[PDB]
Symmetry: D2
């Protein structure tokens, strides 16, 4: 091809800009034009398309968010919506599309590929639950955002006020919670992929206080429930003064870490490789520390899993 497109969909994820830059620079390296599609599939339908020159991706590698923005598009979840998008692409001479985002963005890539239009998905989300990849672009940064709060809370502990609950992001996936929990020394970590007994949790807390543990940190995935509630719940059971922090959308913002920028650079470039090799209808990723790509439809068929051993370890280390 002579001309490709690029968009971002889903919530913002640190590293999207690193991925947009990789896509533009890799394409341009092979003499291919790249056109930016703004506001995701909404902007595609609306015709928000503009050429991205080599310098237009300068000074964005280190920047959070996305210069192409992100928007919801229930219209594109329909055939009338998909139809107008293909029209806008044909109109601007765009022969393939790189889509960067979450579970949502991949369905649109699937549907465009079903309608014969070459499209490759790039995993851009903080929650780590996109198939075809061990890690999504944004996950590493979000974990470092979480542990920055955990580390500050460790300075604020007292003998009376020593129990803390932190509510982290992750729709449906416990990856942020598990990994940030391990990295932050959390005693208890509540995730959708592992059963928890609140009595087992209360016992742990009392055993730790009894042996002189300065403080206890409990991490709660938003997909298990509310931390504000687990906080109230733990107080009146144990009598222990419990402070709850709800981190929220700070977890999607910030400059990406080194790994997120590298992952983004490598996966963006691979998305372009696939489109130029005439291999649309795929998604890219890293698996077992190797770059990979898969059919989107097959990849999406896979259920998300977490490392149960890591969950067990985190319990062991926090005695």
């Amino acid at each position: 091809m002579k001309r490709i497109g690029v968009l971002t969909s889903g919530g913002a994820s640190p590293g999207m800009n690193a991925a947009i830059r990789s896509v533009v620079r890799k394409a341009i390296y092979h003499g291919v034009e790249v056109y930016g599609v703004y506001h995701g599939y909404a902007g595609l339908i609306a015709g928000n398309i503009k050429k991205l020159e080599v310098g237009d991706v300068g000074d964005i590698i280190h920047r959070g968010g996305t210069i192409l923005y992100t928007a919801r598009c229930p219209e594109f979840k329909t055939e009338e919506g998909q139809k107008k998008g293909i029209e806008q692409l044909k109109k601007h001479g765009i022969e393939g599309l790189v889509v960067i985002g979450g579970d949502g963005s991949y369905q649109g890539a699937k549907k465009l590929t079903e309608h014969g239009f070459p499209c490759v998905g790039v995993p851009g989300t903080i929650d780590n639950d996109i198939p075809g990849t061990d890690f999504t672009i944004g996950f590493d940064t979000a974990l470092n955002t979480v542990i920055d709060a955990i580390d500050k809370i460790r300075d604020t502990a007292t003998s009376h006020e020593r129990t803390y609950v932190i509510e982290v992001m992750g729709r449906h996936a416990g990856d942020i919670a598990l990994w940030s929990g391990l990295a932050g020394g959390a005693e208890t970590i509540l995730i959708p992929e592992a059963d928890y007994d609140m009595n087992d949790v209360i016992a742990r807390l009392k055993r730790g206080h009894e042996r002189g543990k300065k403080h206890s940190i409990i991490i709660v995935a938003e997909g298990v429930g509310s931390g504000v509630d687990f906080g109230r719940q733990i107080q009146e059971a144990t009598g222990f003064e419990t402070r709850v922090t709800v981190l929220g959308h700070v977890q999607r913002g910030g400059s990406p870490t080194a790994f997120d920028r590298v992952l983004a650079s490598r996966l963006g470039a691979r998305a372009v490789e696939l489109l130029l090799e005439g291999k649309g209808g795929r998604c890219v990723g890293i698996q077992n520390n190797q770059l990979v790509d898969h059919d989107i439809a097959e990849a999406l068929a896979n259920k998300h899993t977490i490392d149960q051993r890591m969950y067990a370890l985190s319990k062991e280390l926090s005695i």
Copy 2:
């Protein structure tokens, strides 16, 4: 004197360790022994007191929290508890005491003063609400913690969700909200020291969205109310989707900034000087960029104010 003591009281505040380091090193420079009193006034009464060698304040200048710990002491709001405190100090040959902390800590210093025991209060709290000083040790660091969040939230904006409420600490004082609001480009800042009108808050918000402002950030001092309630009010009046972050006790943690460390170092040393100069019942601070000290009880009678011109400015810049 041959020997003095130091302790920390109130919540944790970044720079408390830089303060402790300075009291210890300044005293030792003049050939005076220093004894740490652990757990604030509670450990004072309990006799939780241990000599600090030169020695023991190494590699703490950059560390958040307090190595001496902080605790609550209702007992020390009583004559009986003050006398047990003075007896433990005598018991250990401590001739003067430096108290680093909040208003709680100052009240005890005034009481020890009424009792004839030389004490100097040093302002260690994040909320800036201590008299005899323009700035308290921990305040600058907290501002930077708040703006880290605000900055990350900017990257998160969409058309869908462009309206954000952040609830910051402050207790009764709007300093953290005012200063972090201005630094963060907050559209509205709700503080105890200045009236607000919710319809004017709503009017500015729509006026901003109109003229294409990418997002509105609203900062709420916890002493004004709950971010959750304000975000609801705003979502229910405008229809705009409103996301609330409540930062919490993360604000009291972290490594202190340069300014907090400098201030802590200067005020700590100055506090020891006053003891050795034969004073007591003073509190130290920085006012008009000069080091100052004042009678504790006189200072405590002053009401806290904020810069109202800065508040007006913050409004003017967010159009």
Copy 3:
């Protein structure tokens, strides 16, 4: 005035964008148009001037550098260049100018007013070497960039690698080295405003080694000499393995701190006020924690000093 201008000159400084935002928003608040002048005085002469809208300073408050750029303009140090700048200001309808920069940029401000253009100077530099102001915009941020380095070095000490030299910026002023050094717990701070003796420096190293100090940290202002040279002289003199960091232009970069964003906002706005008050040939600053403005020539005739007490304190605390 119907229309003013704003430019940045000298080196980049954290908070230049906050100051530009404030000038633009403060002018626009009062019904005044604001035109951006790109590339400093060079751009003024070349006519690189573009109106700035309310939203053009959206999402810059938190960014380092300057969206207007800076360039060196020798053409402006002479009388033909200056009046070049003048035809371009009249051609674009610009009745007054805010110059955000260092010392050199003020000179152009002075000369311009004489030719009937009110100009107000705003202090934007990391060096802290401008008269009429206790602090310059970017200084606090530079200090926190330096202590970041010092803090990390504190983790790295061993028995053999125990002595560290870090070279900091500041031009001919010792403020960065002094304040960084106090905040970072430096044992020796070499600055142009204070005598030092390499024997005493070496005496201090040995005293610290003999008493069990884990490491010794040496801060060298660039105005005094080369960190690499000092490090090598220490290792040659003592046999002590000495490690050298030279931070360089990193100190001019990064997101401004809370204090730099506030000072930038207050000072930028003040400049616009002066222009609308009918004043010109002034520069703004903060002195004794109060906003001030001075005649540019008067201000420039003053000599910059550091606080010798803070220098002596740094000695006394690092025993």
Copy 4:
């Protein structure tokens, strides 16, 4: 086993503490005692050994450096030193040893196991140059320390100073330069394991300047040469004013990132598994995103490689 020991050796690496914590807590969980050996093998030989209790590794997970300290020991490279080391182990009833560090530490582990003393190596260094692992503990943190510096330099690019050399660590290994280069959008990266030619470096500089690239960032691995030297060469050849940053031991310092803490936690715990299950003469690692262990002698026989595709990619993208 009923007693093991743990030790740190080589330069400090962010995450060594997380690893120490993991070894202590994993052992204690299985009812095994852990003794800390202070100052590496030097301290082992001197008998600088002290029981580590559950809580003694409290509040270290998030801390840079090593609480056990690190020291050089050439004597441990001799038969006598191995003899005296084993005598101290036996005297203290230590039945196996975990060594956390670099090559020096692994050679010591090999020798120990040839002397029939069980020992497991854990990879702890910033430079990623340890066999049996794709990543060493500290590498990811060091990368983030480097890009902080690169990010800040991006803010400072003037028109007459837009060429920057940054010297990074990695003697022998180009991993830091390569990964931080790619993550940082470096135009040129000089590493030991890929060929460079100054003619290409200068051509690339000029080629980017003509196209309107705002700045050129050159990353030089210290194993290739001196940044100060390369900077001079570039300035002298091109007349482009070139500025130089040598970060130095800053790269070994700071709080570990999430990935380093997770890696340290998983690898420390595995070392304990091997010792308790009667293994020894092994090292642990993560390869292809899977926890692995190897015979130390076999792993040491492997040459270090970097990913050549990543290097090629870094050039493609920085046009």
